[PDB]
Design a protein around this ligand. Structure first.
Ligand SMILES: [Cl-]
Ligand SMILES: [Cl-]
Length: 162
């Protein structure tokens, strides 16, 4: 298993614009298009992203290409984040995948806000971090996914995804 596969499970794959769990227009593999309510605005961002007049539908290839860019940008965000980088640098490869996932779902900014879990993660206090991470809106809103990522931080294995 690896990051891509992991996120592909968590986000799914859809080739027509859809609304995510917060009600925002998304496409493909969790690629957010816009926080705005206008479908047109979404459609507009879609075409700009893709480089052509899609009329709200793309091919698998195009989805995957977004997806790759998005995975890349998440990594690069972490690395450039003063609060994130260090945590990430201290982690093992499986757990890094966990931090990526969160970042992908919630943005650097959002994740950098779990100061306390970050710190526990850094210190390798697995069970503790797992408890603290669960005290969050994130966990209450999307509990199954959050359970998956948390188990991953906790155990450092891919069990939650097998
Ligand atoms: Cl883009
Ligand atoms: Cl969920």
């Amino acid at each position: 298993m690896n990051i891509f596969e992991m996120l592909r499970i968590d986000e799914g794959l859809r080739l027509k614009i859809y609304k995510d769990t917060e009600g925002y227009y998304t496409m493909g593999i969790g690629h957010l298009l816009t926080k705005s309510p206008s479908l047109n605005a979404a459609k507009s961002e879609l075409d700009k992203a893709i480089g052509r007049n899609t009329n709200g539908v793309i091919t698998k290839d195009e989805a995957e290409k977004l997806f790759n860019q998005d995975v890349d940008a998440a990594v690069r965000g972490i690395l450039r984040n003063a609060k994130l980088k260090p945590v990430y640098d201290s982690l093992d490869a499986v757990r890094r995948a966990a931090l990526i996932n969160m970042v992908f779902q919630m943005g650097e900014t959002g994740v950098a806000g779990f100061t306390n879990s970050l710190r526990m993660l850094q210190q390798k206090r697995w069970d503790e971090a797992a408890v603290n991470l669960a005290k969050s809106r994130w966990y209450n809103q999307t509990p199954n996914r959050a359970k998956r990522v948390i188990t991953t931080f906790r155990t450092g294995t891919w069990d939650a995804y097998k």
